[PDB]
C-alpha cells in the first residue's frame, strides 16, 4: 500500500539475497569445476589403454589417441584438457566461469597397480617418473573449496 511498507519488503527481500549469494556463487563454481572433471575423465579410457598396452604413459593427446588439439577437448567452463604423460589436466575458461576458478585447473593421473592402474583426481600435478607425479605448484590450481570430495587427492595419494 504505502511507500515505506514496500521499502521494508524490498529491504527484506534484498537482504536475503546479499546473504544468500556467496553460497550460490559457490554452488555455481562448484558446479562448473564439476565439469572440468567430467571433461577430464573419459580421457581415462584412452590413457589407461595406452599405458596397459605399452607400459608407458601417453605423452600427449595424440599419443593417447584423443583430439590432437587440447583446445578441441574444451567446454563451457573448460577451455581445454591436455594429456601430459598420462596426467590429464583440465583448464577453466575465462568467459562464463565463477570468478576465482577461471583459468584454473585440476589434474587426473593414474598409478601402476600392476596389470591395472588406479586413478586420482586433484589439484594440478606434473609427472616425474612413470609412477610419480608432483604438485604443479604455480598458482593456477582450482582452490580446494571448489573441488568435490572425490577430487581431493594429493600428489602422493596411493
Ligand atoms: C606419444 O607418446 C609416446 C610415449 O611413449 C611418445 N614416445 C616416446 C618415446 O616418448 C610418442 O612420440 C614418438 O612418436 C612421435 C611420432 O611423431 C615422434 O616421432 C617422437 O619423436 C617420438 O618420441 C608420442 N607421439 C607423439 C606424436 O608425440
Amino acid at each position: 500500500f504505502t511507500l515505506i511498507e514496500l521499502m521494508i519488503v524490498i529491504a527484506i527481500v534484498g537482504i536475503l539475497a546479499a546473504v544468500a549469494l556467496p553460497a550460490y556463487q559457490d554452488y555455481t563454481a562448484r558446479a562448473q569445476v564439476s565439469e572440468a572433471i567430467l571433461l577430464a575423465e573419459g580421457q581415462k579410457s584412452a590413457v589407461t589403454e595406452y599405458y596397459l598396452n605399452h607400459g608407458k604413459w601417453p605423452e600427449n593427446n595424440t599419443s593417447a589417441g584423443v583430439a590432437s588439439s587440447p583446445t578441441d577437448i574444451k567446454g563451457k567452463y573448460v577451455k581445454e584438457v591436455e594429456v601430459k604423460n598420462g596426467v590429464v589436466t583440465a583448464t577453466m575458461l575465462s568467459s562464463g566461469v565463477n570468478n576465482e576458478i577461471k583459468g584454473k585447473k585440476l589434474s587426473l593421473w593414474a598409478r601402476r597397480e600392476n596389470g591395472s592402474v588406479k586413478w586420482f583426481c586433484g589439484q594440478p600435478v606434473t609427472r616425474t617418473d612413470d609412477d610419480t607425479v608432483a604438485d604443479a605448484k604455480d598458482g593456477k590450481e582450482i582452490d580446494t573449496k571448489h573441488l568435490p570430495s572425490t577430487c581431493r587427492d594429493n600428489f602422493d595419494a596411493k
Side-chain angles (χ1 to χ4, degrees), residues 5-67 69-74:
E5 219 148 50
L6 171 64
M7 296 167 71
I8 296 166
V9 177
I10 285 308
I12 297 170
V13 162
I15 296 178
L16 259 22
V19 146
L21 74 179
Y24 188 82
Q25 275 301 191
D26 286 341
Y27 177 72
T28 272
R30 201 182 311 116
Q32 305 164 289
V33 178
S34 282
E35 287 324 274
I37 301 179
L38 261 287
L39 225 182
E41 305 162 298
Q43 312 296 205
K44 290 162 65 166
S45 174
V47 174
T48 292
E49 238 47 345
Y50 192 108
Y51 184 77
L52 258 24
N53 280 167
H54 311 101
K56 240 77 196 97
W57 298 106
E59 192 194 23
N60 50 53
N61 296 61
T62 313
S63 297
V66 300
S69 279
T71 311
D72 294 35
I73 303 184
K74 67 176 174 187

Side-chain angles (χ1 to χ4, degrees), residues 69-89:
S69 279
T71 311
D72 294 35
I73 303 184
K74 67 176 174 187
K76 342 169 203 70
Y77 314 115
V78 182
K79 194 160 188 177
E80 55 173 288
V81 174
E82 148 171 45
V83 167
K84 200 164 296 165
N85 281 261
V87 176
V88 17
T89 303

